[PDB]
Structure 1
Amino acid sequence: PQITLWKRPLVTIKIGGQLKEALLDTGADDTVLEEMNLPGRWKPKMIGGIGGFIKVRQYDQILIEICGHKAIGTVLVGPTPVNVIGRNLLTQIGCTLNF
């Protein structure tokens, strides 16, 4: 689809078999989701945003469907203010900016 930006670009995602809402975020290198339970192993990591750094659990090679498009990649889980879909998965679903 073509998504205009007068509203937040929020979409439904499926991860771990659960549905969630997430923000298509071209300013995010990585995908960061709010606290949740995810199966499989993970490694602790740090990520920095506009306000500083937070601790996150890094899950590798996670299946995640974004607005009907499938991706498999790294997902960070931690105290983010909003579920954000970052460029590591936006590229997988073929997302571009156009003007």
Structure 2
Amino acid sequence: PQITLWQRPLVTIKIGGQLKEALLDTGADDTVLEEMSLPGRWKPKMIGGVGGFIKVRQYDQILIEICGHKAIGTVLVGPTPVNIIGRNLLTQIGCTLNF
């Protein structure tokens, strides 16, 4: 697809057996989702932006589907106000900015 930026670039994702809505975000180095359970080991991380920092849990090697496209990578989980697909996964689906 070619996604317009007139509106937020929101897409459906599938992760952990769950369908969620998420923002395709080129400014985010990492993917960050609202509180959920994921399998496997994790370690704590801090991420931050305007408004300050939040503590999240870092899970590696997680499978996700984004708009039909399968990808694997690190997912951060924590008290984010919006589900974010970051560059670590956008690269895997071949997402580019074009103008």
Q: If the TM-score is normalised by the length of the shorter chain, which range does it land in?
A: over 0.9
Deviation (angstroms), 1:39: 1.5
Cα distance in 2 for residues equivalent to 1:27 and 1:84 = 10
TM-score by length of 1: 0.97
Cα distance in 2 for residues equivalent to 1:70 and 1:50 = 31
Deviation (angstroms), 1:87: 0.4
Deviation (angstroms), 1:46: 0.8
C-alpha RMSD over aligned residues: 0.7
Deviation (angstroms), 1:34: 0.4
Deviation (angstroms), 1:38: 1.2
TM-score by length of 2: 0.97
Task: Give the total of aligned pairs.
Answer: 99
Unpaired runs of at least 5, structure 2: none
Identity of aligned residues (%): 96
Unpaired runs of at least 5, structure 1: none
Report which stretch shifted further, 28-37 or 44-53: 44-53
Q: Determine helix, strand or coil for the equivalent of 2:93.
A: coil
Report which stretch shifted further, 37-46 or 84-93: 37-46
Cα distance in 1 for residues equivalent to 2:82 and 2:12 = 13
Deviation (angstroms), 1:70: 0.8
Deviation (angstroms), 1:18: 0.9
Deviation (angstroms), 1:71: 0.9
Cα distance in 2 for residues equivalent to 1:75 and 1:49 = 18
Find runs of 4+ consecutive structure 1 residues off by over 6 angstroms.
none
**TM-superposition CA deviations, 1:42-69 (whole Å, max 9, x none):** 1111111222111000000100010001
Cα distance in 2 for residues equivalent to 1:44 and 1:53 = 13
Deviation (angstroms), 1:27: 0.8
Q: Determine helix, strand or coil for the equivalent of 2:92.
A: coil
